[PDB]
Amino acid sequence: SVRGANPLMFRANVLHMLLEFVLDNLYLNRHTGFSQDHTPFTEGANLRS
Amino acid sequence: SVRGANPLMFRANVLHMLLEFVLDNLYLNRHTGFSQDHTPFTEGANLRS
C-alpha cells in the first residue's frame, strides 16, 4: 500500500529525519541592520529588520 | 501383458531403482543468496532465495 509505512523501519526513518533536521540547521547567523521603534508599547528598543 | 510384471524379478528391479536413486543425488549444494524478511511473520530471519 502506497499510503502506509512499514512499522519495522520507523526507527530508521526517524533517525534519518533527525539527521536531516540537524544538517538543515547547520548554519551561521548573519548580522543585519536595526531600527529604533517609538511605538507606545516599546520605547527605544532596537528591532532587527 | 504390458500391465503385468514378473514377481521373481522384483529384487533386481528394486536394486536397480536404488542404484538410480543414489546416482541422481551425487550433487553439491550452492550458496545463492538471502534477503531479510521485512514482514512481521518471522523475527527478522534471513530467507534463502
UniProtKB/TrEMBL annotation, chains A, B:
Transmembrane segments: none annotated. It is found in: Virion. Coiled coil: none annotated. Inner capsid protein that self-assembles to form an icosahedral capsid with a T=2 symmetry, which consists of 120 copies of VP2, with channels at each of its five-fold vertices. This capsid constitutes the innermost concentric layer of the viral mature particle. This is Lambda-1 protein. It comes from Mammalian orthoreovirus 3. The gene is L3. The chain holds residues 345 to 393 of 1275 of the full protein.
